[PDB]
Assembly symmetry: D2
Homo-oligomer: 122 residues x 4
């Protein structure tokens, strides 16, 4: 939910994700990757279920980073798709797709798939 | 490209994606799914995303992604899809994507939370 | 679906998949990729399929693996295709695939490509 | 490695994977899922890189389970794609695709994606 999601998250790679959850279901913030790629911060936008189920289910959400800022351009974008799980050890459990710009001939090897787990602690 | 991406796109399922590409790399718009929204404004959902606003010029595609949370003022599927892919320009422009759709689940069902697919968007139905 | 699956398939890249489906649910054969991986370009495949699918019009679930090592080449990687066989006049195998390359722990985050191949019985 | 892979492996769900790696790069064995499931055991076949890199890289591998045996049929197949990393705390790190049989109308929601981590310790 909104209060649970807003703030700073860290994944298993040491990347930092800072996000504000809007009451309208918006996600806005900045992503700092510990791997690949002000110089190493990138805009992110996304959406989340602002009215989740109240049976203990997680909160569905996703966001995108385009790996271009004012300094740098990796001609790629990542989307994270997952769910926020609240409680003392709150997590965002994600699967991600990273697509690099390619010619048609190389499109078959355009997309990386992975999983990040974000916690509020390092 | 910004000029190439802005507009109305249709996928192989018959879903409609309307997007504005900002000079800053923002994607904003609405998504109407032909499937899974109780139909086989009702079926319209906010989307937001990002794209490479300075793509390569060698005929490489333009990397982008966007998200839809499947909640509007009518319905809630307690789920979110993210599309990751590339825009390819030309007479027959395409956005080729792979998508992940995560449903809210208990920790028990988390292993079966996430669908994976692929959508191809064109400017004609 | 055993009769349907057994034979030679081609995907949108021009790759060739020859497979025998066993009555036990085994898939065995050889894969030739038109892309990457440089008989020099044939690789062993093994997999499984549902040998008693639903009769209700649903496809037949199946998957197979190729390790990209033969007697001539080694790309230090393996692809798995997960999908369903759809029968009839224009029979198809609709797949999604994961390709993992061997990596150091440092580079594991970029170890895995994901894609989709459609196989038809004609080029 | 052949000796490194061969044996019994356990994932974070508590599923059990027993596998023999052949000298020819073959993987053969049985899989028991703790979730969704002799009754609860299923044939698996796969391949692995039998001459991996000598640079500290993991060993690429994959395998399939069709969720039919003598007792049960979930009309689906899972493929695991990943790598074996040897040493004191040996792991098989995978991502997986589970396709269910569907009608053409429901093909869009045919395939689940996940990640399992296998260790030799229960």
């Amino acid at each position: 939910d909104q209060a649970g999601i807003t703030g700073t998250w860290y994944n298993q790679l040491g990347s930092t994700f800072i996000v504000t959850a809007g009451a309208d279901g918006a996600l806005t913030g900045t992503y700092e990757s510990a791997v690949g790629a002000a110089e190493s911060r990138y805009v992110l936008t996304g959406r989340y279920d602002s009215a989740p189920a109240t049976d203990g289910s997680g909160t569905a959400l996703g966001w995108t980073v385009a790996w271009k800022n004012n300094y740098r351009n990796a001609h790629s974008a990542t989307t994270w798709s997952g769910q926020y799980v609240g409680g003392a050890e709150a997590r965002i459990n994600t699967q991600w797709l990273l697509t690099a710009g390619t010619t048609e001939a190389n499109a078959w090897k355009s997309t990386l798939v992975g999983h990040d787990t974000f916690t509020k602690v390092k």
